């Protein structure tokens, strides 16, 4: 799932 500040 799109996670902030992790590529």
């Amino acid at each position, epitope marked *: *799932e*799109v*996670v*902030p*500040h*992790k*590529k």
Partner: antibody, heavy 119, light 113 residues
Framework: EVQLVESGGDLVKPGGSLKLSCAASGFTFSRCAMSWVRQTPEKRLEWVAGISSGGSYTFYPDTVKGRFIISRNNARNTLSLQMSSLRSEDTAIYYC????????????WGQGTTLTVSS | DVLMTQTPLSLPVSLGDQASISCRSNQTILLSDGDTYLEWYLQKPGQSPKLLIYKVSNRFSGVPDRFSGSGSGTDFTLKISRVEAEDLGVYYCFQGSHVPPTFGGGTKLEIKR
């Protein structure tokens, strides 16, 4: 085209609690991480909560940790911020912000809601 | 945290000149995949902040080719060349490379006259 519109800031007292909200429209909210950035009355910008596309992951700065909860209804596309034990330092324009596809910077920002914390 | 100092605090410039605002981090913004995430945002008079330059040189769509960004590692810089009056506002530089993502102090670009 992306629109993020927020509502909720009212005069709160210290010790209080409020819950601000933000509506998104114009893009598939569920694939975009989202964030709430705030502008202090001295104009310096502080980031206060950030959230993953599914609501699983939640990140907070040390100053709001414990007192602010962020969450998101990925079905009636709203993103929120429930605010507990407020202090006067928390006065500011709260901005609902949309994280990039490449999630380390924000590309669109809401219009803002002033929260005032005072007695 | 990672302090982002920004200089100068207010910058008088006259329509047709060049303005350099510049920003600096006490820690590197370079992640091991070679991406340096320093972005530049614009808060015009009345409105909310816009992305102008993102990931050090790239320009978000819609920003004139007079906003150009350069720098690497720890000193970064914006060049507004041929300043026009509808450029007045406060310029903030930012870093998403480390959590928490910090922001610089702000630079008021003032139109000289």
């Amino acid at each position: 085209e992306v629109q993020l519109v927020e509502s909720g800031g009212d005069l709160v007292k210290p010790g209080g609690s409020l819950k601000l909200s933000c509506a998104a429209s114009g893009f598939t909210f569920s694939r975009c991480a989202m964030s709430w950035v705030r502008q202090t009355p001295e104009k310096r910008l502080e980031w206060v909560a950030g959230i993953s596309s599914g609501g699983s992951y939640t990140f907070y700065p040390d100053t709001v940790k414990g007192r602010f909860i962020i969450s998101r209804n990925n079905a009636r596309n709203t993103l929120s911020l429930q605010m507990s034990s407020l202090r006067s330092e928390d006065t500011a324009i709260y901005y609902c912000t949309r994280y990039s596809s490449d999630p380390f910077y924000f590309d669109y920002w809401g219009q803002g809601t002033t929260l005032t914390v005072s007695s | 945290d990672v302090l982002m100092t920004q200089t100068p605090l207010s910058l008088p410039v006259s329509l047709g000149d060049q303005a350099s605002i510049s920003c600096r981090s006490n820690q590197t913004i370079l992640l091991s995949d070679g991406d340096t995430y320093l972005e530049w945002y614009l808060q015009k008079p009345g409105q909310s902040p816009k992305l102008l330059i993102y990931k050090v040189s790239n320009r978000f769509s819609g920003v004139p080719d007079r906003f150009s960004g350069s720098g690497s590692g720890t000193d970064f810089t914006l060049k507004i060349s041929r300043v026009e009056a509808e450029d007045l506002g406060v310029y903030y530089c930012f870093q998403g490379s480390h959590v928490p993502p910090t922001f610089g102090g702000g630079t008021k670009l003032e139109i000289k006259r």
